[PDB]
Amino acid sequence: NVYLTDSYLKGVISFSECNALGSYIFNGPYLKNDYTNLISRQNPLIEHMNLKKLNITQSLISKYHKGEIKLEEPTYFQSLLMTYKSMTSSEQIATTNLLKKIIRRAIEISDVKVYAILNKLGLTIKTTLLKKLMCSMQHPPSWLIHWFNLYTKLNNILTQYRSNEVKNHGFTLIDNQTLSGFQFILNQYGCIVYHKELKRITVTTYNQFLTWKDISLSRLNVCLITWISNCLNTLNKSLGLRCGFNNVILTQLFLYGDCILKLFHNEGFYIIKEVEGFIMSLILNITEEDQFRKRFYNSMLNNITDAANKAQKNLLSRVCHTLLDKTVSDNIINGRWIILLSKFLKLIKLAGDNNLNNLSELYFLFRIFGHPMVDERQAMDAVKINCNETKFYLLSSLSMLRGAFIYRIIKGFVNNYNRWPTLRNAIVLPLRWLTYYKLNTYPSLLELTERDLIVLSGLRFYREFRLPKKVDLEMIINDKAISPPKNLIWTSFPRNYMPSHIQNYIEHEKLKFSESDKSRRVLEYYLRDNKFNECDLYNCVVNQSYLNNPNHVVSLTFAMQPGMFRQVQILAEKMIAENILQFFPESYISKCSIITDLSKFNQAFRYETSCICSDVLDELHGVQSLFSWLHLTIPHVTIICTYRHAPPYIGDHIVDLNNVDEQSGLYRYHMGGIEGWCQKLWTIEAISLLDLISLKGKFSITALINGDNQSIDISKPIRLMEGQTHAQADYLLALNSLKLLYKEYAGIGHKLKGTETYISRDMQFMSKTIQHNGVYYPASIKKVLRVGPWINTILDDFKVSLESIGSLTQELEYRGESLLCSLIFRNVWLYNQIALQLKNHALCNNKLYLDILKVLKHLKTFFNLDNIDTALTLYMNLPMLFGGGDPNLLYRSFYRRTPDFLTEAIVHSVFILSYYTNHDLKDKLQDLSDDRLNKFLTCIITFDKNPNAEFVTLMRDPQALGSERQAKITSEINRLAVTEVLSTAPNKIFSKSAQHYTTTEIDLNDIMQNIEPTYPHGLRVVYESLPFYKAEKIVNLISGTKSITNILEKTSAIDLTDIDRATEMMRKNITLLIRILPLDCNRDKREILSMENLSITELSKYVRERSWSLSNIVGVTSPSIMYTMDIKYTTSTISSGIIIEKYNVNSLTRGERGPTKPWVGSSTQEKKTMPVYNRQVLTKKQRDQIDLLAKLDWVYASIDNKDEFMEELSIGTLGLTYEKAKKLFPQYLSVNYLHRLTVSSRPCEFPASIPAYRTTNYHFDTSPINRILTEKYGDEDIDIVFQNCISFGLSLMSVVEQFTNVCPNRIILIPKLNEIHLMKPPIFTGDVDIHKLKQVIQKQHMFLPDKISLTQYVELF
Amino acid sequence: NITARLDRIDEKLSEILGMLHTLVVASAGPTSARDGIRDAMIGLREEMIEKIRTEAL
Amino acid sequence: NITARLDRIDEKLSEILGMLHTLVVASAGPTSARDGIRDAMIGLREEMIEKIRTEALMTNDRLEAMARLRNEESEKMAKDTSDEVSLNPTSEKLNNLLE
Amino acid sequence: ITARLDRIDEKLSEILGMLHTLVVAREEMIEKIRTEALMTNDRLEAMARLR
Amino acid sequence: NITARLDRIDEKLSEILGMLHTLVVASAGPTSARDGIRDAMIGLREEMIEKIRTE
Ligand SMILES: COc1cc(C(=O)NNC(=O)c2cc(C(C)(C)N)cc(-c3ccc(F)cc3)n2)ccc1OC1CC1
């Protein structure tokens, strides 16, 4: 049993943890004089005792008591570390030299892709572009060397701890040499830093060290991106990013923010958090007129300075009674800090340069200063007041809200179901309204009156929707934790922090809870439930067993409650999402915009304001209190901070926490809305309020709610007086509507705040996304701060890390709009993980690296390469599908989606190999004196056939290759272990499923065996129609965790079998290229594949079929647009091809807009006739089980066995019998399912690699290719995605201007007809194995959907 | 006139109904659920009557 | 007689819609001893603007409550929606240093 | 019509008596549940006869 | 007609008088005016089952 610790911050820096450790170590309140400084020193944690008992720390402690060293705060040492400029002839020369190598290598790796792209477009370093870029990036600037050095030192302190803690448990790294001057005692339970020259000590947590490492990495990345980009832009102004930062200013920015966090302790983050505000103003000062920006600027300065004043107040109040009392600067008491602030902000405005690109990208600043040590008990105290406060409403205000909600529901019903909801109360309406009931129509907002909204509030509905009667296990199961039941809440605190009467009370309270109640995690909670049944959730919502339930608590850590109430919370949110959000699609003409933050907005809600609208959804679903569960239950439970180190003080002989007296971090009578819970109910009530305001103020509120930001838009037709301008009118309308918004929100318990609300004339910062004049200003750099060695993996998986580096790094291309800056940055951080950090793997010390070295020897001899260095340049270019190192296929630089990954991988390999073979990608494939591409393709098509489980595999990945011809993935590797741990689960729903899993994939493989043409996507649909699709979604989820074996073992340790499985997986995946590409004459093929008249898509066809032996596979194979289309820049006599034209008049169109409509590449729809019946009678998990079976009626109508097929497949799943079910099936008017089937496995849309706005610059004409593709294939469906041709041309327009600094006037794409083939719908011969089809349904019956019952079919009509 | 004044009486007596209903819905809250009174105030509905039948069989 | 008998019913229909357009409801909340919940409390407007003033119903920001229940605009509410927003004394210092 | 209006007024002056006892502060309460619950039940047994 | 409007009123005016009894009986008490809203709901359920198993 091994423990692998985090390499990045994934969690929170705990104020309570740092306070407890430091307070125990130094025998006095360290950070705050709370109860997590008292119990920490009376009864310390064993992990803290071990840290303090060390010989290194026992001497620092003694120095401190004798007064020789000054105890400080971790932000002080953050400032010290970050400005650590310690140099020698052996540290600033062995870091400059390593950086110079990384940069040269990344440019040399990028060179081959750049060569391929320039060769295709027709435009150790072969490309003169990267040859010029190399003479520029020869000497890293001192600012960049600074953060690279700091990141290397911090990171390889962290690596040295992680590997050594994997090797032996309890390891404490004691390091005083890596960083000169500093001395770390690092450990997963604490980090003690001592600086000798200054005589200072901080105690902090492992997460805070992770955060320091993250800060150094993030500033290294900001500097790297910036200085790659500035060199690019010194070469071509259109080759780098849109921003133009100067990095001496940026480093000064870093140091002044560090100084702010040094003066202000933890509190300083309050000030840093107002940075967003300041940047916002600088954007507004460019985009807005005087009154809007002046008002925002003044409110923003008030916000910043109240943040600073509150920061000083809290700092001096906190630090007064602690050991940090004399660590408060005199620049805080005497108010000189205002100058420091003035210099910080004044630097931001200088980094922005009054340029909207710099300003929008400057949002990375909000993330580059670390994270605060959030105080858990104080954040609860700030919320106790807002949630106990009594609210006073006019009964008329509640009636109008209820009525405006009921109006939305009546309107949505009439719009969807062509009907009014069935009224229990029709006698309540007047004649004017009761006449709207009978005509099934509604008045518009214009004809609506507030009396109408009062009268509507009396209507009561009959049930229109139905509860799902059997739990959806895919919605109740996840990786996160679960609050104990109330009586076991004390199990969330260490046994040492709890008094004896609580320890020996909770040793007896466990003897009366089920293993599921004591579980401590959701997955474990359900897997351990030996009395589980699918109808237990449903019986709770009907019997209302979640009311006055003595097991209820709320535990703040993010809030959580026991499983029985979390179930109801998720069900209530899900019913609103499925059934009710259809009615609320928002989830001079003086115009205006009002932006509000609804983060605290849940706090102000009460039962009187929530459950008047939520009571209308109770009636629609025929339930009592399901949607009102929160405000009816939480007022009776105790809200407690259950973070580990922040226990409550429990008075003697109090065991129940409803009897534990209130204190910091523990209170009662919380009225009003734990956040997240019921977030969807509060959104539609807010939209109803907006509709009521629009009525009261006579303006046309458009709305847009997304998370915690409500972006109202307001219009109000007026005609202005003389001397009043449009801007003045808009400002007046904004100020008036703001008054009304305030009054009406206050009418229901909600007091807005000038800080969190503001007004603009144009929709600013709508999605944390600066769109201005249709142009888009990205925050791309912010997305890429934490790109590094082992990101986003489990057990440091080498391939997933590569995948995440590559995926995150094309935010610099998709949004940043720099292909080459994304490329070079990708290659820096890829070369670093392959060539430098691979030998340091925490679990596989250099195994993976020795495998890479022998894979490179193989590559060297296969392609007869002159070096093992030039063999790594090749390994990191050829695709990851063939066991290579390239995570981003070259096609994704032009369009984001493809139906056929294998053709893209093969085209990528061809293009890359052209670098060494000097083939020309514009010219047809030809014979050349060197055969390296012939050898590559021959080893690809020629190989041993070893098909196994062909059909169950093509089902769960319709693009799988088979015959061990592609790299496996963690789900397949871990599946057979997941099912063997599940076979032992006490909950029989998973036990029996996992016990029958292997047999069910044996016969799920036999079902579609004998259907002579193979359609893997139809196979996908058959798969999803069956209860195994849902059985192994729970398996695919559990196989993504770490330590699958211990899931039921109650440890965070990774089992050694899991380590070995992951290690074998990684080593096989690394070495795949040796097997895929053998040297042995390419399998005794002394005659290599010929390239004259070769079509790569026929080759891909052959490789895929051969890989399974399958005589025919239809569907999947599709050409490559990159390969298929030959790029031209003039119209010759040929007069063929797609034509992409620039409609702008200016040569450079990056960061512009154009007349054209944006190109969303949407798939032509699935043309069908929807039959007439009562949709709402069926639950959504019944309605898409019909659309699946109807899709199978469509695809497989021609099989010899269809009547029996859909008879057994309709009775098994739906419960109807294929003639009662055929009535509900949509009837497809589309002949070709190959072209039109919509299924999980197929792209829904085909966008370009281009921000949407930019597509609006180009006009595409596909007319000349429909003339050629018609007179040859007539009007038959052919096999080349239509959307992706346009996507390719559009992206091609950008990429050419990136490398040329001119946008082409037009580009003509001329296809390779060879690559284009007919795609007509086959006739499916053979039967279905109908006894095997029933075997799947029977052995996986527990995951079957709800049966369309008999009291549910008669009322379908 | 007569048969038009009852229109006003109807339109106002409907507004009274809306008022008094929203007041019942809001007045049956955390302390009614606690005392087992909310269902008597908002009235039994489909999924609970269905259960009472299934018990009747 | 049917224009008089009908008018006396139309006067009890304006004072039932006056007594109902006047009610204020206090959200249910913790008791003053704060050991339990007390029901949502319904009462006439003016009798609700004295129970806040008396602090009989515990409420914070009581002056804003009285002002808003009255069809009246307070100072903080007028401050927060004003056409021009006034810089606090230290934000005038900051603004002077940024200039 | 006179009797109808008299009966309307006699009930509208008894609404007020209750509407004053409300801003100052079961058989009739539990006959409106049973009646409506019975109506939705008999509306549920209309769907049970079609099956 | 004026009897199709003088009969809609009496049924609209009996809704109001039923929604005033709920509010007054809930507010009035408690612990002896609410314990009786629970016993009498036990009665509701256990007499609804008795009218249904005999139809
Ligand atoms: C959404 O998944 C797919 C879509 C398509 C698709 O769209 N096939 N295309 C045509 O059927 C078509 C037909 C015709 C005709 C009727 C002869 N004039 C012309 C053209 C055409 C194209 C480009 C041009 F520039 C001009 C014309 N395309 C193909 C495959 C797909 O995925 C499956 C492989 C897995």
- The CA distances from residue C37 to A281, A480, C28, C54, in Å, are 45, 33, 7, 20
- What whole-number distance in Å separates Cα of residue A918 and Cα of residue A119? 10
- In the β-sheet with A1125-1128, what is the strand arrangement from edge to edge? A1125-1128, A1306-1311, A1138-1142, A1258-1261
Across the interface, whether the CB atoms of D44 and B44 are under 8 A apart is answered no
Tell me how many degrees the CA angle A788-A790-A791 measures, rounded to the nearest 5: 70
- Consecutive H or E run containing A667: strand A666-667
Residue A391 burial class via C-beta count within 10 angstroms: exposed 0-12, middle 13-18, buried 19 and up:
buried
Q: If you ran DSSP here, which 8-state letter would residue A1146 be given? A: S
* Partner A contacted by B6 (CB < 8 A): no
Q: How far is CA A340 from the centre of its chain?
A: 37
Closest CA to A785 of A82, A154, A220: A220
Cβ neighbours of residue A443 under 8 Å, at least 6 residues apart? Answer: A436, A452
Instruction: Give the closest residue to A1164 by CA, choosing from A1232, A1226, A1257.
Output: A1232
Q: Where are the beta strands (DSSP E) in A1090-1154?
A: 1125-1128, 1138-1142
Gap positions in chain D, given as the residue before each gap (C–N > 2.5 A)?
25
Whole-number Å distance between alpha carbons of A1336 and A1003: 7
- Residues belonging to the binding site of A for Mg(2+) are 597, 708
Own/partner contacts of A1146-1151, CB < 8 Å, gap of 24 or more, are: A1147/A1302, A1147/A1303, A1148/A238, A1148/A1297, A1148/A1301, A1148/A1302, A1148/A1303, A1149/A1254, A1149/A1257, A1149/A1293, A1149/A1297, A1149/A1303, A1150/A238, A1150/A242, A1150/A817, A1150/A1254, A1150/A1294, A1150/A1297, A1151/A242, A1151/A357, A1151/A775, A1151/A777, A1151/A817
Alpha-carbon distances of A753 from A166, A278, A1293, rounded to whole Å: 50, 18, 47
Give dist(CA A925, CA A875) in Å, integer: 23
- Yes or no: say if A1177 and A579 are a contact pair by the CB < 8 Å rule: no
Of the candidates A254, A303, A245, which has an alpha carbon nearest to the alpha carbon of residue A278?
A303
Tokens of A649: 């003080």
Q: Rounded to the nearest whole angstrom, what is the distance from the C-alpha of residue A1153 to the centroid of ligand 1?
A: 29
Please identify which residue in the block is written with the tokens 């010989």: A55
Q: Closest by alpha carbon to A331, among A383, A260, A254, A277? A: A260
Chain D neighbors of A1351, CB-CB under 8 A: 47-48, 51
Spell out which residues line ligand 1, taking CB within 6 angstroms: A 899, 1115-1116, 1118, 1138, 1163, 1235, 1262, 1265-1266, 1269-1270, 1273, 1275-1282, 1285, 1319
E46 touches chain A (CB under 8 A): no
Query: Helix, strand, coil proportions of chain E in percent (round to 5)?
Result: 70, 0, 30
Report how far residue B24's alpha carbon sits from residue A68's, in angstroms, rounded to the nearest whole number.
Answer: 71
* H or E, element range at A84: none
User: Within 13 Å and on the Cβ side, how many CA atoms surround A1204?
Assistant: 13
DSSP conformation class of A1139: E
Q: Measured between alpha carbons, how far is C98 from A397 in angstroms, rounded to an integer? A: 45
In the numeric block, the tokens 């037009």 are attached to: A1306
Chain C nearest-CA residue for A746: C68
User: Nearest to residue A113, comparing CAs of A863, A936, A819, A810?
Assistant: A819
Residue in the block written with tokens 């899991």: A1058
Report how far apart the first and last C-alpha atoms of chain E are (Å, whole number): 39
A173-175 β-sheet, strand order? A70-71, A200-204, A190-195, A182-187, A173-175
Q: What is the DSSP string of A1201-1220?
A: THHHHHHHHHHHHTSS-SSS
In the numeric block, the tokens 């949607």 are attached to A627
Phi first, then psi: what are they for A874, rounded to 5°?
Answer: -85, -40
Determine the Cα–Cα distance for residues A242 and A1100; give it in Å rounded to an integer.
Answer: 39
A1036 CB contacts (<8 Å, ≥6 apart)? Answer: A971, A975
Closest by Cα among A730, A726, A686, A735 to A710: A686
| Residues contacting A240, CB < 8 A, separation 6+ | A228, A229, A230, A231, A232, A233, A818, A820, A821
Cβ burial, residue A214 (10 Å; 0-12/13-18/19+): buried
Residue D43 CA to residue B45 CA, distance in Å, equals 11
Cis link prior to A499 (omega < 30° from 0)?
Answer: no
Q: How many whole angstroms separate alpha carbon A922 and alpha carbon A920?
A: 5
In this structure, chain A runs to a length of: 1357
Q: Which chains touch B (3 or more CB pairs under 8 A)?
A: A, C, D, E
A116 Cα–ligand 1 center, Å: 27
In the 8-state DSSP scheme, what is residue A1318? Answer: B
Nearest to B45 by CA among A81, A462, D49: A462
Please tell me the distance in Å from C18's CA to the nearest CA on chain B: 10
Way it was determined: cryo-EM
Please, are residues A74 and A206 in contact by the beta-carbon 8 Å criterion? no
Question: What backbone torsions phi and psi does residue A1322 show, to the nearest 5 degrees?
Answer: -75, 180
- Contact between A812 and A825 under an 8 Å Cβ cutoff? The reply is yes
3-class SS at A770?
A: strand
Domain residues of chain A, as ranges? 15-84+141-381, 473-748
Which H or E element spans position A904?
helix A901-917
Look at the alpha carbons of A688, A690, A693, A698 in this order and tell me if their dihedral is positive or negative: negative
A817: left (phi over 0), alpha (psi -120 to 50) or beta: left
Name the CA dihedral angle for A975, A981, A984, A985, rounded to a multiple of 10 degrees. -90
Neighbouring C-beta atoms of residue C71, cutoff 10 Å: 8
| Contact by Cβ (8 Å): A863, A1079 | no
Residue pair A763/A769 in contact by the 8 Å Cβ criterion: no
How far does residue A1248's CA lie from ligand 1's centre (Å)? 17
What are the residue numbers of the active site of A?
A: 1235
**Nearest CA distance, D3 vs chain C (angstrom):** 10
Amino acid occupying residue A300: M
Q: Which long-range contacts (CB under 8 A, 24 or more apart) does C78-86 make?
A: C79/A754, C80/A742, C80/A752, C80/A753, C80/A754, C81/A735, C81/A738, C81/A739, C81/A742, C83/A291, C83/A731, C83/A735, C84/A294, C84/A295, C84/A298, C85/A295, C85/A298, C85/A299, C85/A302, C85/A754, C86/A298
DSSP state of A496: T
Distance of CA A1179 to the CA centre of its chain: 28
Q: Which chains touch C (3 or more CB pairs under 8 A)?
A: A, B, D, E
Q: Identify the bridge partners of residue A366 per DSSP, sorted by sequence position.
A: none
Cross-chain residue pair B31–C42, CB shorter than 8 Å: no
Tell me how far the alpha carbon of residue A1330 is from its chain's centroid: 41
Report the amino acid identity of residue A258. D
Please choose from A1280, A1319, A1320 the residue to mutate so as to test ligand 1's pocket, defined by most ligand atoms within 8 A of CB.
Answer: A1280
- Distance (Å, whole) CA A632 – CA A611: 9
Cα separation, A571 vs A563, in Å, equals 12
8-state DSSP, C46: H
CA dihedral A926, A927, A931, A933 (to 10 degrees): 10
For residue A772, CA distances in Å to A240, A264, A515, A722, A764 come to 21, 36, 56, 30, 8
Sign of CA dihedral A1293, A1298, A1304, A1310: negative
CA distance linking residue A229 with residue A361, whole number of Å: 13
The 10 Å Cβ neighbour count of residue A174 is 15
DSSP state of A25: H
Residue type, A11: G
Contact status, residue A974 vs residue A1061, Cβ threshold 8 Å: yes
